[PDB]
Structure formats: structure tokens, C-alpha cells
Specification:
Binds DNA as homodimer. The protein is mostly helical. The protein has 3 helices and no strands. The radius of gyration is 17 Å and the shape is elongated.
Length: 86
């Protein structure tokens, strides 16, 4: 479906998780800047060298795709289009 050849499953998974658990901090605490930096530092410790800004932008994208992506509720619709004068 998608291919950016930038982030690997390993890194992605690690980031997502960290963002999933810390997510709360973002809900309870207004400021996030501090949360972003924290996540990064943690990642580096694991063995993944990734800047804080990278994770931030990468996340936002994961949300846009996560939503658009299929969902439990039924209702896929007609993806394909009608061929003019088929």
C-alpha cells in the first residue's frame, strides 16, 4: 500500500508503543513538546537513533493513515471506479 523506505517495522513499532503508553500524558498534560523529547531519548536508549522532530511528524501521519485505514464498523463502499463506456 505505502512505501517510504524511511522507517522500519522495528523502529515504527517501538515508537508507536512509546506513544501509545505516553499518550495519556498528552491528554492530561496540555504541553506535549516535553513529551516528544522524552519519547525520543527513550528510543535512543533502546538502540534506535531517531530525532524528536522525526517521531512527532511521523506520528501525526500514523494517525491520518490509521483513521483512513479499514475499521471494524461495516461499510467499505465501492473503491474501484466505473469505466466510461465499459
Amino acid at each position: 500500500k505505502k512505501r517510504a523506505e524511511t522507517w522500519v517495522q522495528d523502529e515504527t513499532r517501538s515508537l508507536i508503543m512509546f506513544r501509545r503508553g505516553m499518550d495519556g500524558l498528552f491528554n492530561t498534560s496540555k504541553s506535549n513538546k516535553h513529551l516528544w523529547e522524552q519519547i525520543s531519548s527513550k528510543m535512543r536508549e533502546k538502540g534506535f537513533d531517531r530525532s524528536p522532530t522525526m517521531c512527532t511528524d511521523k506520528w501525526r501521519n500514523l494517525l491520518k493513515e490509521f483513521k483512513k485505514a479499514k475499521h471494524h464498523d461495516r461499510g467499505n463502499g465501492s473503491a474501484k471506479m466505473s469505466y466510461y463506456k465499459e
